Specification:
GO cellular component, one term: extracellular region
GO biological process, one term: carbohydrate metabolic process
InterPro entries: Chitinase_II/V-like_cat, Chitinase_insertion_sf, GH, Glyco_hydro18_cat, Glycosyl_Hydrlase_18
CATH architecture of the largest domain: Alpha-Beta Barrel
Keywords: Glycoprotein, Glycosidase, Hydrolase, Signal
CATH superfamily of the largest domain: Glycosidases
Organism: Nicotiana tabacum (Common tobacco)
Number of domains: 2
Distance between the termini: 4 Å
Shape: globular
Strand content: 25-35%
Length: about 350
């Protein structure tokens, strides 16, 4: 089976019951948290009610959809995970609790989104964690007579992140697949001084791209059939220094007030509305495979229909396992989700 993946989180505003699970093969419920006292996977009080109903609810619209409990994410305390991974006892309590929790709530898989291990030692310990997690998953399957839980991880676009190599052999051996975060390459909260496509498939300038990411993972020894390409249903708004200069790499002054206060982010649906209301000029750039729009001193990078279609065709043609979307609520009336699914076509 190929992967048509989608991430959801409660604070996205999309009701659990309104996720169109017909457009996906796998849905990721984000995020479960690490209790640093117990070194166990838990679900926060705020997430409890929805997470407990996640699987049964989404299966009402599509009984064949499979679900993952996603772990950690961008807002998690990385040092807590480093501590957990440091010792066999804390790895075991984490592993055992994750398996129990997945089974209890009906999840068919666990997805580790540790963003990111802080040192080379942490990366090594992640490798060890995955070795032990796989063994425990296989053992639980053998003892219960049930099909094994799936185990995946969301990882950076490149297997080298913040100057640190992932434990690529362990990832390749132990995971059913990796979810490649082929987005957030650039953003006004970290690269404020020029515009850029945050998710470009190609990059002849600096080779910071989804295709270059895929290639780096392949070169690192991870098989093509264990790669799932991330596609963003959101973008970022920069403030242009000069409204007349509005291409890629245009001088900028950080985040635009049309985007989120913290990072300038905007869901795809918000961007689409903005384009209509502002009469923004839109550009599909065929070289990079990415979209942007501009109006006055506002400039926004995102993926629209043509980009999504082209990315999906590209990874299908290259024999990757599939794609996933971060995140489903960002779509405009399921437009990009449907484009992606129908472009891929038959899911096996």
């Amino acid at each position: 089976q190929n992967v048509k993946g989608g991430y959801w989180f409660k604070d996205s505003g999309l009701a659990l019951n309104n996720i169109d699970s017909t457009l996906f093969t796998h849905l990721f419920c984000a995020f479960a948290d690490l209790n640093p006292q117990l070194n166990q996977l838990i679900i926060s009080p705020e997430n409890q009610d929805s997470f407990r109903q996640f699987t049964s609810t989404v299966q009402r619209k599509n009984p064949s959809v499979k679900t993952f409990l996603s772990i950690a994410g961008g807002r998690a305390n990385s040092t807590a995970y480093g501590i957990m991974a440091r010792q066999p006892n804390s790895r075991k309590s984490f592993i055992d609790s994750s398996i129990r929790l997945a089974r209890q709530l009906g999840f068919h898989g666990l997805d580790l989104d540790w963003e990111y291990p802080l040192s080379a030692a942490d990366m090594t310990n992640l490798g060890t964690l995955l070795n032990e997690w796989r063994t425990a998953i296989n053992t639980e399957a053998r003892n219960s007579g049930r099909a094994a839980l799936l185990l995946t991880a969301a990882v950076s676009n490149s297997p080298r992140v913040n100057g640190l190599n992932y434990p690529v052999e362990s990832l390749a051996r132990n995971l059913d697949w990796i979810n490649l975060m082929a987005y957030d390459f650039y953003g006004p909260n970290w690269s404020p001084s020029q515009t850029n496509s945050h998710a470009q498939l190609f990059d002849p300038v600096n080779h910071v791209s989804g295709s270059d990411g895929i290639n780096a993972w392949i070169q690192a020894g991870v098989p093509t059939k264990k790669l799932v390409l991330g596609i963003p249903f959101y973008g970022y708004a920069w403030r242009l220094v000069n409204a007349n200069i509005h291409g890629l790499r245009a001088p900028a002054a950080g985040k635009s007030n049309v985007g989120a206060v913290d990072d300038g982010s905007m869901t795809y649906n918000r961007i689409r509305d903005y384009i209509v209301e502002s009469r923004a000029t839109t550009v599909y750039n065929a070289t990079i495979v990415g979209d942007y729009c501009y109006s006055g001193s506002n400039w926004i990078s995102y993926d629209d229909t043509q980009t999504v279609r082209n990315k999906v065709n590209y990874v299908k043609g290259r024999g990757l396992l599939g794609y996933f979307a971060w995140h489903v609520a960002g779509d405009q009336n399921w437009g990009l989700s449907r484009t992606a699914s129908q472009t891929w076509g038959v899911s096996f």
